[PDB]
Amino acid sequence: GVPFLTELKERFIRWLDHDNDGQSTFDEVKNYIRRFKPDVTDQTVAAFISRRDSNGNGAIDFVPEYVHDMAAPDYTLEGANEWFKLQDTNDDSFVTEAELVKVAEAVGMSPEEALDTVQGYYMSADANKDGKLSLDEFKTLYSP
Ligand SMILES: [Sr+2]
Ligand SMILES: [Sr+2]
Ligand SMILES: [Sr+2]
Ligand SMILES: [Sr+2]
Ligand SMILES: [Sr+2]
Ligand SMILES: [Sr+2]
Ligand SMILES: [Sr+2]
Ligand SMILES: [Sr+2]
């Protein structure tokens, strides 16, 4: 569906551009990802910016880039993999229940809200019940 542009802006400010200058520069994207992957590498942060940076100015611009990306959200494996990798705190190519719960708490959920999100919705994709998601399990969460 179509997002509320005013909410997109409030989200962009609160997550990526605290100063509302219209750009999310390196240290801003890093402070964003560090909330939930505290030992995120500088190169991960750079690749996140590059997928969004259509004008090549090394920054995520609210306009046109954030609005373009968010106005028409769509599924791709590459896009799903980016969030998978950011939740894979130990980079072992699985997201465990505990990693997903810690990320949920880090982005502002209470302990019980985080547990109920992960143990309900996320683990519904755990086809072999081993307590963790592969990329192939995780990607199914985009098409309930
Ligand atoms: Sr200020
Ligand atoms: Sr900024
Ligand atoms: Sr990283
Ligand atoms: Sr840009
Ligand atoms: Sr992991
Ligand atoms: Sr369950
Ligand atoms: Sr599994
Ligand atoms: Sr589906």
Automatic annotation (TrEMBL):
Record carries keyword Calcium: yes
Record key words, sorted: Calcium
Lineage: Eukaryota, Metazoa, Spiralia, Lophotrochozoa, Mollusca
Originating species: Lymnaea stagnalis (Great pond snail)
This protein's name: Calcium-binding protein
